[PDB]
Symmetry: D5
Subunit: 165 residues, 10 copies
Amino acid sequence: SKAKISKPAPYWEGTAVIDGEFKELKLTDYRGKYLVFFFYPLDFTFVCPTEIIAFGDRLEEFRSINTEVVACSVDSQFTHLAWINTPRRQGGLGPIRIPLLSDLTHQISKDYGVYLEDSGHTLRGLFIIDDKGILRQITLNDLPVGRSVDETLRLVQAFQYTDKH
Amino acid sequence: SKAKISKPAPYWEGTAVIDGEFKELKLTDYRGKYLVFFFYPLDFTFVCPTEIIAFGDRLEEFRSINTEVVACSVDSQFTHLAWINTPRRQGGLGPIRIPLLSDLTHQISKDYGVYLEDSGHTLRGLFIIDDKGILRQITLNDLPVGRSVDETLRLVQAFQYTDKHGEVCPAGWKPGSETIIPDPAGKLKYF
Amino acid sequence: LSKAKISKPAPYWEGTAVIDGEFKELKLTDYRGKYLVFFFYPLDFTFVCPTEIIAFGDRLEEFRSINTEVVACSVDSQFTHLAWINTPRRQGGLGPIRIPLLSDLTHQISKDYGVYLEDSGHTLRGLFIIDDKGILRQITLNDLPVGRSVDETLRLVQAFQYTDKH
Amino acid sequence: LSKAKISKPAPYWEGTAVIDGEFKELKLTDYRGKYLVFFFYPLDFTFVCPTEIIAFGDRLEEFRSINTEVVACSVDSQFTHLAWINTPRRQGGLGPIRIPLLSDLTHQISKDYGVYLEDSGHTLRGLFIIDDKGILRQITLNDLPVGRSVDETLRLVQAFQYTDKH
Amino acid sequence: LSKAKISKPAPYWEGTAVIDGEFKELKLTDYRGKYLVFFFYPLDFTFVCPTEIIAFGDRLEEFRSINTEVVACSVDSQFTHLAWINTPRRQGGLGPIRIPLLSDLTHQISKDYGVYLEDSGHTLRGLFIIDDKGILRQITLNDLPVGRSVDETLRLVQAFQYTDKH
Amino acid sequence: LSKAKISKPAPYWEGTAVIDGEFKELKLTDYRGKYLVFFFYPLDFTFVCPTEIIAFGDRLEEFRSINTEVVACSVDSQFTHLAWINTPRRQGGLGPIRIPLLSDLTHQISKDYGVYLEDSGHTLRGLFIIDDKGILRQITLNDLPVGRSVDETLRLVQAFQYTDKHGEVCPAGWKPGSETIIPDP
Amino acid sequence: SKAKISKPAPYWEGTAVIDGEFKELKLTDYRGKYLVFFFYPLDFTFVCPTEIIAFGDRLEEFRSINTEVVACSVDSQFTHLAWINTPRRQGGLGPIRIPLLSDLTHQISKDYGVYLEDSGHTLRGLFIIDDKGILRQITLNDLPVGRSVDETLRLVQAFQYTDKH
Amino acid sequence: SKAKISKPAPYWEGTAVIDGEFKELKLTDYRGKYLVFFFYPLDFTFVCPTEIIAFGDRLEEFRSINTEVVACSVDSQFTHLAWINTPRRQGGLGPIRIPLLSDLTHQISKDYGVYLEDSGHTLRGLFIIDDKGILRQITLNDLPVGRSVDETLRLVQAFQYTDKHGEVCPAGWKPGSETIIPDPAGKLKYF
Amino acid sequence: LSKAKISKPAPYWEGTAVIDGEFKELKLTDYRGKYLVFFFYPLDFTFVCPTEIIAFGDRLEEFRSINTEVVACSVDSQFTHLAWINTPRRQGGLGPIRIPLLSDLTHQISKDYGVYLEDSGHTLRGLFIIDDKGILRQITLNDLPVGRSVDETLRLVQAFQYTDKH
Amino acid sequence: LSKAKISKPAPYWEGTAVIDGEFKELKLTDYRGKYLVFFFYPLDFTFVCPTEIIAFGDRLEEFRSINTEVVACSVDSQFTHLAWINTPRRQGGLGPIRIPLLSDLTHQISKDYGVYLEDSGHTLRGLFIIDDKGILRQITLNDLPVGRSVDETLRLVQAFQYTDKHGEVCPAGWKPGSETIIPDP
C-alpha cells in the first residue's frame, strides 16, 4: 500500500460513470476540495448499494462543506452503467449523483491497500483526502459491515475545523 | 505492518496499568471476547483526554456486549501511572477503568502500522478484534481528530450481528435496522 | 507468464460459474473424458451484441453430439454474469444461455492462459480446444474487434477426434 | 521465449526464401503496406500430402485481391525447400508453388514466434495474421495432426480489414 | 550501531528539550566553545534517574564556572519531561531544574550514542564528556541500578581541560 | 566489532600474565565468584609515570576485602611486562606490583573490548567492571591523557554489590551508608 | 563442446536412415568397433555428397579393419531419405551403405562443437572414436573443403597399430 | 579455447629458435601468407621426430605456395636449442629450417585448446591459417599418432583454390581434380 | 596461492623424477624420517642453475651424513632433465648427478610452493628446508641472477637439528 | 595477503624507529639509492641473547662500505625498543646499537611482509634484501629457533650488486672474486 496518513494521497486516474456517461477522472481533479474516496466490493451485490445510495442521497451535506464523494470498485465502467440503469427495486443503484470509478486493472485498489488477492475485489475501504491532496483518514471494514455517512461527515467537519483553528 | 483485516490480529504483550497497578497483558488474554484495541499519541499533552475518558465512562456499554477495551501509547508504564494519578483538573486522566498498555519498544505500534517514524509516537489508530482473535476493522485518524464511542459501538454490534445471522449490514445500520440476505434472490426481500 | 502449451496438459483452473441461473463451482477437471472448448471474451454489458456467446449456445447440441462441452469466461464477477443473463437480449443482455459463464475475478485464469491484457484489465478473445485427456490441442487468439466461428471450432474438434482415432 | 503479442508489432524476421524457383532474401518489413498471412509447417518431404500449402497457393488470388500476401515457413534449409518444390506432387513433392517458402534453419524465427518444439526440432502448425502496419492481429496454433482452413483465414483477414475501416 | 568514538567528533544530535519550563529546539552545535557533559537516564518517574539529575542540577555552577554545560536525556517525550519537572520532589518529581531535559522519543539519539536497550525500550545510564571543539573525550556506561557521580564527572572535566592546556 | 555489552557476559579472554614476577596463563573465567576490575592502559615504558597502576596496586586490599580482584592489560608482550616490573620506579619502571599484568600481544582482547586504537596499535584507557557471574556491569572509556580513580572504582564495585544484594537502587554519589531507593512506586 | 580427445566421445542418439528405413541409432551401438563419425553441412548441396559418396563407396576398407562409418547433418530424416532417393545424376546420394543420422534439434552438433550458430548447420567435422568409445581424433574443416578417405584410413590404421603395439 | 574456424586465429607471440638463434615471433609476422601452425608434445623423447623433420625436409613445397610452417611445444627456447644441437643419431633434431616456438607459460596452448591439464604439455594439434589471418582448419591427434605432410599440403592447396575460384572442393580433391559450382543449378555441370 | 607456511606441514608433492638415469615416481612422503632440502631452479640448459645443482650434488654426503636428503626441481619435463644429465659438464650439462631431478611440467608444485613466475613460465630460485616430521622450517627465495650456498644451507639444517634436540 | 614479491617493489612502510637513542620517523623510501637489508625479529626482552642484532650492528661498516644499510624491526613499541637499548647487554638488554630499531606496533608492516604470526602476535625471523631502486631481491624466512648469518647476507648483497653491474650471473657459493657466467649460449 502507498496510502499513508499525512502524506499525499496516492494518485489515481480511470474511467468513471458520471451522470450516465463515461468520463476520465483523476484524483487531481479534486484539488481545492475535500474528497471522500471509498471502495466497495462488487456491483450487483448487497451491502455495496445501500452505502452508495446513502452517500448519494445525502451528497449536499458534503458539497455544502466543500467536499466531494467518489465511489470505486474493480467492476468495469460498462457494469457500473448497467447497475445504475437497474432500478433500486431490483437491487440496482438507480440514477446516482456520485461518480462510479472503475478499477478493472486493480492498480488503484492495490495502491490504496484495499485489494483482496484471494477474492479479486476490494474490502470496504474509505479514505478522507483534504483539499491540498493530503490523506487524513483511513477506514477499513471487513465485507459484512457498511460504513456510516454520519461518521464520515463528523470526520470531515473535524478535519476542516482543526485545519482552520 | 502485520495488521490485515480478516486475519488474526498481530499478537502483542507488555506492561499495562490496570486499576493503578502494573500488570502483564497479552492479546490472547482476550480470546472469547471482542476487543477494541486503540492507540493514542502521548500522555500529558495540553489537549484534554476526551476520547480515553469517553471510553472509560461508557465502558459498561461494551461489557454488556462481551467486549473489552484497551488503550495504548509509546509512553512507559511509569508515565501512564503518573498520568492517571494526575487530576483531570490538571490535564491528568484521574482514575480510569481501561488498561493503559505501554509500548516503549515501538514493536506493537510498528506491528499495527500506526507508528510515526518521524515523530516517535503513534497516530490515532483503533482496531476491532473479534472473539476468535480475528481483525475485523481498522480506523486510522490523523493526529488532530478524535474517535467516536458511538461509532465504535455501532461497528462492534454490526460484526456480532453478521457473525450470528450472516445477513449483511447496510450503511448506517444500528440495532433494529433492516439487514440484507447475501443472495442475488434473497436480497429482494430487502430492496 | 502463460502456462498454455500445445500437447501439454491445459493449465488447471477453478472458480465460480453461472450455470442455468445459479452459482456453481467449476473446474477444468470436471471435463475429463470430454473435449472442452474453453473461450475468453473481454466484458459483459458492452455495446457490441453478444453474437458469439449466443452462436455457441444456440449450436451447443452440435458440440454435445461429439462429446464436446463449451465454457465461456471473462474477468467479470459471477454476479455481473448473472445480471447480464437476466437482461433481455433486446437491451444488449445475454438472455437465457446454455453455456456456463465462468468468472475470472482474480485474473489468475486469464494470466495462466496468456489472454490477459495488463493495460486494459480484461482479456482478449482467446479460444482453447482441450481434449478428453485434458491435453491442450489448439490455441486461437483474436485481437478484440474480431469474433470467432462456431463452424471453425466444430471442424477443429472433429478433426482432432478423427486423428485421435485413425 | 516468444515475442509474438497481439496488438504489438509482429516479431521481426529475415532469411532466405524460395520464390518461383530462386533463392531470395526476405524480411517481415517487405510486407509493410499489406496484410500478411505468415504460417509455419513442421517439415518438407514427409509422407502426409501438402494439402494446406497447396490450398493456399491455389487460392492466392483471393488473398492478393484483398491486399494480403502469404508466406510459409519451416525449419528446413532453402535447398531442401527447392528440392521439395522440384519434386512432382505425384511423389509427395510440392510441385510449382506461388507462395514463398522461407527457411528457418537457425530456429530463431520459430522461437520468436513461439512455435518451436524443443523436443522435436521443428515447429508446430502456427499461423499469424499481421496487418499492413506490421501489427500482430491473430494467432492460431494447431497441434501437428490438424491442418488449417483457407476459408477461415480469409474470413479473419476480411474481418480485420472491415473493423479497421469502420 | 554506535557512532560514538573517543577522539572523534561527538555524534550530532538535535531535538526538543524542556528548558526553564518551555519547549526549545536544542542542537549539539549550540555547545561549541564549551565543554558539554551529555548524559542519558532511563525513564521519567523512576528511581536513580531523579537523584542523578537533581545532583547535577543543584551543582550546576561548579560546571558553569569551568565553561562546562550539562544536558540530560531520556526516551521520554518533552510533555512527560515537563510534567515530571512540575512534580514536587516530595512525590518523586524533579521539581524545577536548571538543566535542559532533551527528549529522544524516536530513539535515534540513544542509538547514535550506543546507549539504547532494544529489549527494554529505553537507555542505560550513559554519560559522555564532549570538549569545546565538539570532540568526544570520555564515555561512561553504567548498568541501570547504579548512579553516576558529580564529583567524578567534575574531576574528569578538569583533568581534560588541564591536559588540553598543558 | 566490540563484543562488550553491559548486562551481557563479558567477552571471554585468556593469555599470559606476569604475576609476582612469573609468567602465568590467566583466563577471565578464573575470576568467576568474584567481582573483577579489568582495565587497559596504553604502553609499558613511556615517559609518563605509572600513577594509576601503582595506585591500584597500593590499594589492592580494599578491593580484596570486598571480594574483588584487579587485572591490568596492555598490548605489550609478557617479556616487556616483566622488564618493566624489574625496572625501578625511580627510572619510570613499575617496580614490584601485586596486580597481574596481562599481555594482549595479538590485540584480540583489546578488539573484543572495543578499546583498541587501530591507528596507534595500542589501547586507550578503558576500565571494565565484571560481576561474580561474568556479567559486564560498567564501562569506563578515557581518552589517553586522563587517568582513572581508585575511589570511583571502589564506589562502583560497592554500589553494584549493594544493589545485587538489596535490590534497592543507588542514587547519584551513593557511597557505603548513604540513602538508597526501593525501586517501587 | 563436450568433445575431448582421450575422453569418452559424447553420447548421441537419434533417427537415421539406414538402408532406406528410419532406425534409432546410438553411439553405444558401436562399442567393440572403431567409428568414423562425421558431420556435413546440408543435404541437397555440393561438397557434402562427394565426401559422403567417397566414404560409402569405400566402406569395405573400413569394415575390413573393424571400423564403421556414420554421417550426420542437421537435416531431418525425411530430407535424408528424399536425398538418397535422388539419383546421383541430379546431385543426390543415390543408394548409400552408410547411415545418415539426423540432428534436427542440433543437440548432437553442439555436443561435438561443430554447430554454426550464425548459419544453422554444421561445419565439416570428423571424429575418430575407438572401440572402447574413447575419442582419438578431431578434424574440423571450413565449409569449402572436403575431407579425405585416405587420410581417415591412415589415421584409423595408426591408432589401431599403436593400440596394439 | 579461442580457436574458431573462420574467425581470426588467436594471436600469439614468444621466443622461437630460428636458424640456431633466439628470435621474437608473432602470429602477425605471417600476415600475407598461409601459415601451418602445429604443436607437438615434448622435446627429447624416445620417439624419433619423424613429423618435424618431414616438414623441415619438404619446406620448399610449402614456400612455393606462399605458406610458412611453425612448430610449437611447451619446452623452453633453451631446450629447443639444445634439441636442435643434438644429432639426429641420438634422438636430436639436428639442424632444422622450421622455427621452434616456445610456450613455457602454456598461454598459447590454452588459447588453441591443445593443452593437456593432466600432463602439462599439448596433444598433437595442427592449424591452417590463411593470409588474412583467418583460421581455416583444425586437426587434433591423440598423442600416439603423427601428422601427414601430404594431407597438410592438400588442405592448403584446396583452401587457396576455393579462395580464388570460389568453386568448392570435393572429397579427396587434389590439384587437377574436378570441382563443384556452389549452386543448385551450376552443380549439375559436375554431377 | 602459495600453501607453503613455516611451522606447518610442507605442501605435499608428487611427480616424475630422473633418479640415476631412470624415471621414478617420487613423493614428498618418501622423505619422512629424514630432513629434506627441496629447491627449485628456473630452467635446464641455463646458467646459475647447473652450478647450484652441481654443488649440492658433489657435496651430497655432507647432507646424507646428517640424515638429510636433497631434491631439485624445475618446470622442465623429465625427458629434458635426462637429456641435460647426459650432457657433458663441458657443454654446460649437468653430467651424471646423485640428486633426483623432479619435473613440474604442470606447474602445480611450483604454484603450491609459491615460486612460480606467471610472467616467465618457470620458477625463481626457491629453497625449502623440511624436517623429518614433514614440517616446513625454512624458506629462501632468490631473484634469478643469484645462486644459493651449500654452506649456508648446511648451517641451517644443522641449526634446526640442534634446536630440535636441545 | 603478503605483498612481498621478488622483483616487484618492496611493500612500502613507515613508522617510528629508535636511532642513536632517539625517536625518528623512518620510511622505506628513505633508503632509495642504497641497498637495504630489512629484517624482523620476534620480541624485545626475551631470555635468548640478541646475538643476531648485535652481530649486524658490530659489522655495520662492511655493509656501509658497499652502499648498504640495515634496519631491524619487531612488533614492540618504540618505548620498549628504547628501554631495551638502555638495558646493559649484561642483563639481556641490547646496549647501544648502530642499527635503527623500527617499531611495528600496528602489525601492518609485518603483515605486508608476510612475517606476522597470527597466533603469537609477533613475527618469525624474516630478512629481506631490497635494492637501490626499491625492488625486493631476496626473501629469507626462518622458523623462530634459528638465527641469521651476516656473512651470508653480505654475500647476497655483493652478488646482487655484481649482477646489477655486470649482468653475468653468480654461481652457487659465489663470493667476491669467484668465477661468473655470461648468461649467453
